[PDB]
Amino acid sequence: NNPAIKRIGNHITKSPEDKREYRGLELANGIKVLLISDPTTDKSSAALDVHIGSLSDPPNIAGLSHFLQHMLFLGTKKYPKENEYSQFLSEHAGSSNAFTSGEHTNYYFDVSHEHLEGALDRFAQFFLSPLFDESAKDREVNAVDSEHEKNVMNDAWRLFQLEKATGNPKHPFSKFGTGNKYTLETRPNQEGIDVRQELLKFHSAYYSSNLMAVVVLGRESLDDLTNLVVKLFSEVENKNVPLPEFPEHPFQEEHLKQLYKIVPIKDIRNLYVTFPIPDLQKYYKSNPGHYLGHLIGHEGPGSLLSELKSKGWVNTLVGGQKEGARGFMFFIINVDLTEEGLLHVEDIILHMFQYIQKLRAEGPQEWVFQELKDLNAVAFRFKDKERPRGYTSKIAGILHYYPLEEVLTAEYLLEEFRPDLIEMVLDKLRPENVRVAIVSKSFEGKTDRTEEWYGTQYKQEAIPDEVIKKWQNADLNGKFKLPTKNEFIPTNFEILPLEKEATPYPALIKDTAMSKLWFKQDDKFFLPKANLNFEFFSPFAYVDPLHSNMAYLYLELLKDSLNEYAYAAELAGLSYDLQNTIYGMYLSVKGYNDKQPILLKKIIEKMATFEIDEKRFEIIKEAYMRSLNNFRAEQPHQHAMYYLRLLMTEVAWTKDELKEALDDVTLPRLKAFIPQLLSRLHIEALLHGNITKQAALGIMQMVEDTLIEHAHTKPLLPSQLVRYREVQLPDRGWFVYQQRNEVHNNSGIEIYYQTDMQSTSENMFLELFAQIISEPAFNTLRTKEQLGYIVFSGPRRANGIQGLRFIIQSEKPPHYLESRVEAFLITMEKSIEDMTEEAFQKHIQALAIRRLDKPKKLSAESAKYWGEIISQQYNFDRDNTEVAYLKTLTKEDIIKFYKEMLAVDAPRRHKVSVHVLAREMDSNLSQAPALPQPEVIQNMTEFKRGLPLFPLVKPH
């Protein structure tokens, strides 16, 4: 017997496919613990979840628990170095994050499997004694202000708080969880608050052992993992805190039957219908909300969305239960809106109740429950193995809701059929219980009210009683039907015998004029799934802006046509993803192999014989137009990235020219485009999974045959296969492109140091440098210097060429950011010299681990092979190669590189910069070097015209 453990749970129910081993237990202090042993793991991981979050913010200091969450990283009593934690992770091939929901704070990391203890030790200290250093507090507060700034002009966040701000303002639901500089510093200062005290108070109050869950995954035995957790965690003090409850719904009497008219940032049209419901969490075994979600949100024949779409009122629908906190939930039905749809909100909603009526009239259907239960049992049996960081985080959250034994299964398995609950919930989905929100730009000027935090323009209104009544007397509508049996549900799960001449990597098993088939039968995972991947090539998909718009619209109309038929495939774990590229088209079909050929064939067949609906075309096109415009609202750092993409690629049509060319797109014009595009193609494919060589060849041949027979498709010349090149910046040059972001009041910057095209050695020079400076950049540019919340560095790789890049979104002007990266860059060379050849081998070791990290799921392996294929590099063995070569490097090699390619006065320094200025802008602290006279990019195609272009990498 052991005093530190309260108990060990019985066998934790796992999938029979899951080779990992699990143990559940409760510590004497009350912490619930899942331990995961996985002797194969390359990265170990752990997470902690506290059942406290921003719903428990002091009302006088909004965002304290989010802030507390940021502060825990910045040093503890026993590892006081501000970034000891993030550096230890960085040097041992790990990484970390955290988040704060209304009732949770969740902290997780991974590390190289061999440094679990080290990582874990430093990590426990967050919950034992965090310094909340007084000057760390001052600095890190800006990070939060930026976190928020980002969100201010963001349509989803505004809506998210706007909901909170129109229920009982007495309710903790109505709190602002993020916080900013104002609520965490400027206001607490005015009100004489010692924040470091409040951070100590709140931590000591709530970070209590009984409100805590831990998951630990590593190669260690279950006994080792046990002793280990006992060791680092027995010592967290139990303050016995009562777990917050919220029996009162934030939406009370007066908050029902309300209409809100809301002005968005982007030009989007949306209708949010919401009903309050009580907390369904405890019904999880039988789950009535999912049942109604499945049905109301259904998209097949008969479905609510079908009629709404056919009347050309909505395009998409989400519906179902949506979490609140302990005590209250919501049930929602949300759709977007065509221009017509906007003028028929009253009608749309009526149909909604009409459909709800049909449900009441039919009553609970057990076979529908059966279907849900079986799909979930299949989902569970053959669930892909999760990346450990995500897994631990996820389970730590659910340890607060399910018996130990159930944690794994709890969010999957269904057990009890409950017509009473289905009925009981259904009863709440009534007009007298409804809230309605319309988000449109048509409400510009028309609003009389403003949200405190985001500044959202809205009007409120009681919904007229005659209207409610029209909705209450909603009849049966003969357009609405329950779904029928899902024929796509799989039933064949046999894992075909592993073929006699299978190989570690995909073999090129076909190389004809029309197609190039890559194939590997799965030798790792043995689930009954497959990925089927196809690059279709056409000169016509991108030949000009107009053709781009058509390649898009075409494909959107295809998806839209197929949607009803394909929904069923998707509930059944068969899904497809089809879009236009700058080379033509991409098609990926993923999921259980069993009915896979069916979907594929229906897709190809539809493409090749496609019949456009006039009304659909007009609607999709209107949306695409708004969509191009809505780019204007994107975050500064993405404008930055977008412009850089445009500047450095041989051919790239701007959103502006796409928008411009889009009126010229007529129904006649598109009918003609489709066959044009479809008549000359080359297909390169990856087929990877539970399938045989022959099965694969058939599938490939079937695609081709379907095209030939229906579109008369013929090959493409080898020489037509035109890959685009990257621009070649001149030795010692420096260009700057600059633009205003007319929406966000932050600025964005991307700085690109182009090195030399990809190749084993030039790759590892860049990667190792990036590894070395990865966490110093973050810690310098963010933690210390607080330039912004978004601070990123790392490699850039496009069109076979590469370089180092920095990405920052910040309140300071881009020119200023320039010099601080430049400063930082000296600081780097200055410390690559100071660093021990040990410190240096540590960093080699980290990259090594990162690079050699084995895929845990088919998709992840597929993806790697795809990367090789679409980049025409075909270096399937690249990792062992590039790592082998890596170990070879030294302090000299890298210092040489820095001075050659990167340093301010490098012989071959090649620098480009995109400045995206804030809504309104113009024209202790280390040394920034004096920088050259920047050659300001005037015009994008002039710039491209006056420079060489790099080669394309030769295929391995």
Binding site: G63, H66, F99, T100, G177, G293, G297, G320, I332
Partner: peptide, 10 residues
Amino acid sequence: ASLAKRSRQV
């Protein structure tokens, strides 16, 4: 679709 927010870092 059946329905399937959260302040962060990195």
